[PDB]
């Protein structure tokens, strides 16, 4: 707290639950997405590392839009991107703005860009940004565009706004225009899905074999990484449900290992959250608006 003065509660709200700083966390736990990984590195990381090189025609975009089905790790992708540029991270939802924090919001959208503005390099992550760019809602939704044109008005500032959306087909020309680059973050590849599962099972007693991984991969077509997590929780319930009344007395170590059937059954309960008709409406939007 210094050099600036809004309600001193706004500032705290930022230090407390927007402002974040994570060092040297690479891509860790973000599975797959090689395409997008490459691009973010080219368009944001490299530029933040060498602003002496990336000027003139080699300037980075000030606005990148990540879009795709929900539960594809978009918010963490942002956290890693920030971590590799050794940048101050600012995570914030547009719903937290247009509901949890209204009236106060417009004053906060301002203070956000001010803080960011002096923690350079800074990365501002706005989740569900399509709501923000579509009432006190309008008062805020305006201050926002104000704030974000300013970003396109300071030349040598290492300040990127990173916006994420599950509903890109919901952004008009003037909206999409604020985004030089537009990255499609899509559902886990088959091999990605099983890496997730392996992360999620660490610390849980299980007999999952590589041959099993393959069966799981086989019946988790269309699953997001969030579904995969749902899957694992449900699968882990198998042992739990085999008990009954010993439950309150049983040794946790005596709990049956998680097995492939656990997943096979789990899969029957936990189904993909994305309708095939949507994956197309994404691919269509992407090939006509995305940096493919």
Ligand X SMILES: Nc1ncnc2c1ncn2[C@@H]1O[C@H](COP(=O)(O)OP(=O)(O)O)[C@@H](O)[C@H]1O
Q: Assess contact for 153 and 36: CB atoms under 8 A.
A: no
Sheet of 63-67, strands arranged across: 19-20, 88-93, 122-127, 159-165, 63-67, 181-184
Q: Which class for 75: exposed (0-12), middle (13-18), buried (19 or more C-beta within 10 A)?
A: middle
Q: Does 217 bind ligand X (CB under 6 A)?
A: no
Q: 7 or 191: whose CB is closer to ligand X?
A: 191
Q: 109 or 187: whose CB is closer to ligand X?
A: 187
Please state the closest distance from residue 274 (CB atom) to ligand X, in A: 11
CA distance 162 to 91: 9
Please state the closest distance from residue 154 (CB atom) to ligand X, in A: 28
The residue number whose beta carbon is nearest to ligand X equals: 225
Q: Does 76 bind ligand X (CB under 6 A)?
A: yes
**Taken in order 80, 286, 282, 191, is the CA torsion positive or negative?**
negative
Q: Which class for 182: exposed (0-12), middle (13-18), buried (19 or more C-beta within 10 A)?
A: buried
Interface pick for ligand X out of 229, 255, 283, 290 (rule CB under 6 A): 229
Q: Does 168 bind ligand X (CB under 6 A)?
A: no
Q: Binding marks (x or -) toward ligand X, 147..166, rule CB under 6 A?
A: -----------------x--
Interface pick for ligand X out of 10, 11, 18, 32 (rule CB under 6 A): 32
Is residue 31 annotated as involved in ligand binding?
A: yes
**Interacting residue ranges for ligand X, rule: CB under 6 A:** 29-33, 70-76, 164, 188, 196, 224-226, 229
């Amino acid at each position: 707290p210094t050099l600036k003065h809004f309600d001193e509660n706004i500032i705290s709200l930022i230090e407390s639950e927007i402002m974040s700083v994570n060092n040297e966390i690479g891509w860790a736990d973000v599975a797959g997405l090689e395409g997008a990984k490459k691009a973010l590195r080219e368009i944001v990381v490299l530029p933040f590392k060498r602003p002496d090189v990336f000027t003139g025609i080699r300037a980075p975009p000030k606005g990148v839009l990540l879009f795709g089905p929900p539960g594809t790790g978009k918010t963490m992708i942002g956290r890693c991107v920030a971590s590799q540029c050794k940048a101050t991270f600012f995570n914030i939802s547009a719903s937290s703005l247009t509901s949890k924090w209204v009236g106060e919001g417009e004053k906060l959208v301002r203070a956000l860009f001010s803080v960011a503005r002096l923690k350079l390099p800074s990365v501002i992550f706005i989740d569900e940004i399509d709501s923000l760019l579509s009432e006190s809602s309008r008062r805020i939704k305006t201050e926002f565009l104000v704030q974000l044109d300013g970003v396109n008005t300071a030349p040598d500032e290492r300040l990127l706004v990173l916006g994420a959306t599950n509903r890109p087909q919901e952004l008009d020309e003037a909206a999409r225009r604020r985004f030089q680059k537009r990255l499609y973050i899509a559902l886990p590849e088959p091999e990605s899905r099983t890496q997730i599962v392996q992360n999620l099972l660490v610390g849980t007693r299980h007999d999952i074999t590589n041959h099993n991984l393959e069966r799981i991969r086989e019946l988790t077509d269309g699953y997001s990484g969030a579904d995969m997590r749902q899957l694992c929780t449900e699968a882990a319930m198998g042992p739990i449900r085999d008990i009954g009344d010993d439950i309150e007395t049983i040794d946790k170590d005596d709990i049956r290992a998680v097995t492939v059937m656990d997943f096979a059954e789990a899969a029957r309960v936990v189904r993909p959250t994305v309708d095939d008709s949507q994956l197309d409406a994404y691919a269509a939007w992407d090939k006509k608006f995305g940096c493919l």
